[PDB]
Each structure stands twice: as structure tokens, then as C-alpha cells.
Amino acid sequence: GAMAPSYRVKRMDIAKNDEECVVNAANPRGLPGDGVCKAVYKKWPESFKNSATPVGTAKTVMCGTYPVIHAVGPNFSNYTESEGDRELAAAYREVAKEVTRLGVNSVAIPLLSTGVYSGGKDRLTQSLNHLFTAMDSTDADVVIYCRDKEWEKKISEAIQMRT
Numbered sequence: 001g002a003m004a005p006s007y008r009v010k011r012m013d014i015a016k017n018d019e020e021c022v023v024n025a026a027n028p029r030g031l032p033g034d035g036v037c038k039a040v041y042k043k044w045p046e047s048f049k050n051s052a053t054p055v056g057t058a059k060t061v062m063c064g065t066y067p068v069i070h071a072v073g074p075n076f077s078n079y080t081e082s083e084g085d086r087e088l089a090a091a092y093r094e095v096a097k098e099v100t101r102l103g104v105n106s107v108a109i110p111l112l113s114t115g116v117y118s119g120g121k122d123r124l125t126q127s128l129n130h131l132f133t134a135m136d137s138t139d140a141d142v143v144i145y146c147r148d149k150e151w152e153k154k155i156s157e158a159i160q161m162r163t
């Protein structure tokens with residue numbers, strides 16, 4: 001565990017993270033994909049060996065000794081709002097289990113289903129709250145990665161509001 005477990009946000013590529021493990025915003029088939037998933041494929045291609053896993057689940061594969069937690073958020077193009085919400089919450093609960101099992105003191109996490117799986121909606125608050133719901137009972141330092149300047153401000157605001 002971290003001595004004083006925290007949440008932070010950074011605006012940069014999660015493939016350059018300074019944490020003990022990474023969460024991939026994976027597809028269910030373990031394909032290289034786009035966005036975060038492709039950056040993760042380029043950095044930790046070895047972690048894509050048998051990484052395929054269903055929607056709402058997380059599967060960890062080592063790259064050397066570095067854990068890559070493949071978390072499959074729903075594609076809101078395919079799911080109803082209600083079912084997509086349920087699966088997005090579930091993916092994050094599975095990430096919390098894996099982070100706990102691995103015994104890491106820090107984890108780099110993107111906001112699941114906020115990019116090409118968002119169904120063209122802004123899901124910052126929805127995705128972040130499900131992240132908090134899952135990770136609040138863990139003692140790892142959580143570092144959230146984003147790419148948009150306005151999202152960095154809103155995530156930072158949401159973290160500070162609860163401190």
C-alpha cells in the first residue's frame with residue numbers, strides 16, 4: 001500500500017507513466033486497437049499474449065515484470081445507456097481486484113469508454129465516478145491519464161472537491 005493513498009491526474013501519454021503498473025483501455029479481442037490501446041500495444045506488445053477478455057472484465061498480462069491490466073469498457077455505440085453503465089462500473093471493479101492482487105503501490109489508469117467507445121457522448125464524470133467507486137477502497141496511489149487540457153482541469157477539480 002501507499003503511506004497516504006492519493007489520486008492525481010496527468011495530461012500525457014499513459015505509455016510514459018511513472019507507476020508500478022498500467023491499465024489498458026482494451027478491446028475484448030486483444031487487438032492493437034486505437035488511442036490508449038495502440039500506445040499500450042506499441043510500448044508493451046508482449047502483454048497482448050492471450051489478453052482477449054469479455055466486456056466488463058480486466059485481464060492482467062505481464063510485460064517482463066511490468067503488469068498490464070487489460071480493462072474492457074463497453075462500446076456505448078453497441079450497449080444501451082443502462083447496460084453500458086453497468087459494464088463500465090464492472091470493468092473498474094475488476095481493475096480494483098487486479099491492482100489489489102498484484103500488491104502494487106501505484107497504478108496508471110485512463111478513463112474507460114470516454115474515447116471511441118463513448119458513443120460520441122462526454123462521459124468524463126460517468127467514467128471518473130465509476131473509477132472512484134472501484135478504487136476508493138484500494139490503497140494504491142492512482143494516477144489518471146488524459147490528453148485534453150479541459151478534461152485535465154475537470155478531473156483535477158473532481159479529485160480536489162473530495163479532499
Ligand SMILES: N#C[C@@H]1CCS(=O)(=O)C1
Pocket residue numbers: 025026027032033034035036037038115116117
Ligand atoms: N483506446 C481505446 C478504445 C478501446 C479499445 S480500442 O483501441 O479498440 C478503442
Ligand SMILES: [Cl-]
Pocket residue numbers: 011012013016
Ligand atoms: Cl505525451
Ligand SMILES: [Cl-]
Pocket residue numbers: 025112113114115116117118
Ligand atoms: Cl474508449
Ligand SMILES: [Cl-]
Pocket residue numbers: 146147148151
Ligand atoms: Cl482526454
